[PDB]
Design a binder for this molecule. Structure first.
Ligand code: SF4
Ligand code: SF4
Ligand code: FES
Ligand SMILES: [Cl-]
Ligand SMILES: [Cl-]
Ligand SMILES: [Mg+2]
Ligand SMILES: [Mg+2]
Ligand SMILES: [Mg+2]
Ligand SMILES: [Mg+2]
Lengths: 626, 628
């Protein structure tokens, strides 16, 4: 099928799309076609529903009519408020994630979280000391955890002048944020202030709205997400390099297949632990399975990969196709980026669709709510549901289409520094010498507007060919992994300088750094490099790219990268092109404010050209002559 | 007016006169733009459109081929509409949240000695509120120590560690128990807003019932959190309202004075503007410029506040705001945030009027920004008044048309003022309800909306209710409506039924009690909670109602939602953008009755709205066993 071929570059996606068509199962691609053409006002951002004097639409008419909303707001204000609420939704997605990790560490510190513990005590004491906990090196671990919990919760309060982890940013960058009124103060506060500013008759200046959009996103990258990453390492272990596999072939016909979907390792890590209990394994054996096979989807899959080496079944647009294999006995979901279509596709099979979060409710799902105090009991119950579902699997409808592809994961900053000998100097020396021209974080989603992973893979291949090391997070992990680029042998696909450094270190030219929350690791790495060199992040040869993004979370990441000084490419435009002034600020004006700007470019080769050009300009401003 | 169009836009002569003047001068008004935006987009109107990711944007249609039944992610009309309504409520809750937060920061600055010109105006209320919320020895410790501890309690409600907001303890136990089992208990003022934005991200909360339950939780975090903190701390800093006389309508502007209109919500600004205008050297500068004096007049909620606490006359409500500039006598607008139409900047530029912004959150392209904070407000507000005096020297006398004589009103009915008028306890009020002299109470709290002839429904409903012996509690835009109708004075007892007239005359109060700004709808919650606790019943058992006949804003929807979720039947004149989902609509109008003991009503006929509100009151009186 030419239609099926154009929807993905991967054979496992093609096979399941053929199977879905034969069974009459509609997919995300089919509904994307139904929603094309899109509403032009919605696509341009020139529409507002923020009060019932409206709703309003804006046009650029020579007769002057419909230039303003009923309240008098123009296209610049309307577009900027819509973009601000878009970013606020993304920041909120990460904020609640981080909040749940604080709650879990608190429960551990109180001794009220059976099955949870502090699995990286050394990092707990290091992070606590970094953030000002007294005597963090020597006091009892649960006391230190309690004080760290208080620091993190206070960043979710309204009394700080700056978030705790913001101290990692170089002084020049913190001074810039302070002058601009961009310093993030509270993780929830900035989100709430964005919703206030975008109410009718509050903030009606597009520049002011975009500045607070930056502040809101910064409260994610340096707050909600960074707290989420660092406490996740403390509770579940700091990632270290390890081998795994990727694609739909990680599912096993002879096993109970449990797919974890969403973002919360507080659930997926306890699901994994339940599948390892002797009586649970025995129940699977008694049902006829060879054993129990946990496989990851989305960000929670990324995190199980980073910390446990659990193979990943696929990324965003693979999620429906994973069920169509007919071998998914249960989907265990928490929250964010979980398409509700999965509930209906699971209903075409035996698959149990289990929700676990009070925030991730799906009509028709089997809800087994998980909290730290009951997770060990509840996750055992969920695995037993999966084993029962396995007994009802129809063998005539099973088709697992591929052989899994080997990958290497686990490149936390701690792992990178260890591979470098303990200091960033060997990496800095390679950048100075020109063996590594720079670094690009490729961090985006999938989007039905783009042939799945075609841009993700092409950009990754282009950058490493040009001696630009790629840091991969989120959906891009599966893309690069299936492309064979997440292994040390992929140094053969890099340019001569990057290949030599990778082979000297024994690492791939593409480093898996985790989930979308773990883009905070990229912020930490940039801050460390800038601080070591005595410059701003906006002076580093770095970039970020989201070639196939779709979510509000992805836009929030892009915004906090830009606001932190990282040039950021998007494959597709946000819904802002109805305002030339807002668009010009995003693409150009922000350069003269925060030292970086957005780029929109659907050709991944041209995107590589633009990212390299920024890196070349940054190298020149550092005076590098190589 | 002789123009049928102009007559159709408002019931008031001062609005008619300025609409004629605006048209003659080529000034476009909110009504003109409302016509340009009619007809509206059908999907936006119905709520069946989604822009929450760029897999979309999506529209939900009812087609024969079954296409466009779902968004690209698979979400149906119920989820999309519920998420849109949830973000709508969160925007309104956030409007009040930041307001309340700024009052905490101001009280903190006073407690620290870092707010020149600000004091604790009501120390007795400070000690009472602090003791109520658990401050140790609030009755005896130094006032600034007590204030610092109250500040900490309020800030903790803007944190993430509480199981329930501090003021929620005012609600009856039966209501708190119900919220707890529903998962509706508000925990943190900012937290519920942030969680709503998380739930409405693609692929998070995809159950319309869950989404509406959290919308109720988010709104409750406003009414019992952001707004109630705002009200109580505003009383502490600026005084508890007491009954007093004032005036309303565009005739409160003075041709012979420097006219300064305060607009927005923040008394932290308006009280210091007023203080600056009373300084002898500032008054002398105005007189040296040719003015008799400086004349402060209120708009919107900050006008409501200055009326309640200082008796400052109010120039008008929402749809009067553009028309106030068209008088040609507005020498300055001093704005802070919320419900300030950006059209006012352009209309001000048609005149001499200075448009001054004061909040880092309320930025308007082209405005004169003079940012106000507690530490500099005394100095900055003086600078702002001097800007107004300078603007006055540039006023064109030939373009001045102040069209009416002001109407006398009575304001200041805080709960403290009501209880004092009753002799100290609610018992005489309860006795009048039991005796059937007052059948019940309705808060009329809404906005204006160009979809409805200005104040036609506000005034008709108010008249209908008091005629039926239902006392009206008026806040927000309705204050100006009831005031211009002559209903905010004790003599208006003649317009009420026999029972309400007798009670009003025995107390010397109007049949319509002005209880303040939109933040002060928290006073109505406190009153309902007090009556329910005193009677030993739920708020859902009281003969009460709420009504927003001409609403427009997200803030107004959040107020309506927290009224419903607290057990108060709530009427809206116009539907929220939800009718594209029958299930969400049915939940709002009917299903919530069997969840929280109250529901929304949508009814554009104010007489029929009166019938529906009365029928609820009749049923609650029956459930209380009243036979009168
Ligand atoms: S806020 Fe202004 S532009 Fe938006 S819907 Fe309301 S009147 Fe229209
Ligand atoms: S969240 Fe779902 S319904 Fe909304 S725009 Fe995205 S794909 Fe469409
Ligand atoms: S659907 Fe209403 S403007 Fe796009
Ligand atoms: Cl004292
Ligand atoms: Cl509590
Ligand atoms: Mg706990
Ligand atoms: Mg500022
Ligand atoms: Mg302060
Ligand atoms: Mg619950």
């Amino acid at each position: 099928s030419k239609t099926i071929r154009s929807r993905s570059i991967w054979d496992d996606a093609h096979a399941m799309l053929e199977k879905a068509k034969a069974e009459g199962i509609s997919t995300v691609w089919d509904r994307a076609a139904e929603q094309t053409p899109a509403c032009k006002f919605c696509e341009l951002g020139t529409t507002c529903r923020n009060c019932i004097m409206g709703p309003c639409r804006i046009a650029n008419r020579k007769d002057g009519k419909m230039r303003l909303g009923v309240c008098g707001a123009d296209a610049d204000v309307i577009v900027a408020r819509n973009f601000g609420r878009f970013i606020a939704g993304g920041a909120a997605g990460h904020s609640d994630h981080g909040r749940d990790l604080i709650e879990t560490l608190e429960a551990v510190a109180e001794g009220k979280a059976p099955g949870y513990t502090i699995r990286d005590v050394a990092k707990l004491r290091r992070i606590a000391a970094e953030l000002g906990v007294a005597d963090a090196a020597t006091r009892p671990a649960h006391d230190v955890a309690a004080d760290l919990v208080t620091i993190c919760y206070n960043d979710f309060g309204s009394r700080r002048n700056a978030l705790a982890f913001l101290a990692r940013a170089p002084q020049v960058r913190r001074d810039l944020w302070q002058r601009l009124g961009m310093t993030p103060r509270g993780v929830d506060r900035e989100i709430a202030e964005m919703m206030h500013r975008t109410h009718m008759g509050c903030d009606n200046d597009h520049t002011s709205l975009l500045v607070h959009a930056a502040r809101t996103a910064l409260a994610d990258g340096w707050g909600g997400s960074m707290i989420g990453t660092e406490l996740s390492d403390i509770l579940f272990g700091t990632p270290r390099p390890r081998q795994s596999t990727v694609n739909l072939g990680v599912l096993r016909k002879d096993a109970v297949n449990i797919l974890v979907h969403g973002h919360n390792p507080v659930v997926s890590e306890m699901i994994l632990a339940a599948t390892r209990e002797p009586a649970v394994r025995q129940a699977a054996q008694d049902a006829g399975a060879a054993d129990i096979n946990v496989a990851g989807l989305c960000c929670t899959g990324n995190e199980l990969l980073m910390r446990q080496g659990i193979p990943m079944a696929g990324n965003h647009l693979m999620t429906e196709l994973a069920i169509v294999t007919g071998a998914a006995d249960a989907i265990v979901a928490d929250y964010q980026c979980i398409m509700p279509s999965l509930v209906q596709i699971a209903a075409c099979y035996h698959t149990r669709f289990v929700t676990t979060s009070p925030k991730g409710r799906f009509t028709g799902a089997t809800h087994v709510e998980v909290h730290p105090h009951n997770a060990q009991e509840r996750c055992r119950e969920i695995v037993m549901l999966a084993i029962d579902a396995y007994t009802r699997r129809d063998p005539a409808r099973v088709d697992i289409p591929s052989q899994p592809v080997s990958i290497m994961s686990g490149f936390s900053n701690e792992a990178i520094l260890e591979a470098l000998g303990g200091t960033p100097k060997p990496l800095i020396d390679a950048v100075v010498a020109g063996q590594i021209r720079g670094f690009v974080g490729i961090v985006g989603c999938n989007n039905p507007k783009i042939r799945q992973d075609s841009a993700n893979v092409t950009l990754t291949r282009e950058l490493i060919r040009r001696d630009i090391m790629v840091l991969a997070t989120g959906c891009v992990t599966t893309a690069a992994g299936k492309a064979g680029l997440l292994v040390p042998e992929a140094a053969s696909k890099a340019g001569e300088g990057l290949a030599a450094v990778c082979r000297s270190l024994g690492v791939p030219p593409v480093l898996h750094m985790g989930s979308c929350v773990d883009n905070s690791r990229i912020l930490q790495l940039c801050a460390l490099l800038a601080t070591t060199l005595g410059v701003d992040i906006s002076d580093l040869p770095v970039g970020a790219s989201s070639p196939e993004w779709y979510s509000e979370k992805a836009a929030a990441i892009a915004m906090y990268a830009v606001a932190s000084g990282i040039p950021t490419h998007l494959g597709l435009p946000p819904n802002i092109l109805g305002s030339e002034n807002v668009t010009a600020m995003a693409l150009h004006g922000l350069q003269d404010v925060v030292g970086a700007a957005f780029m929109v470019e659907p050709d991944p080769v041209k995107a590589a050209d633009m990212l390299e050009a920024h890196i070349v300009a940054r190298r020149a401003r550092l005076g590098l002559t190589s």
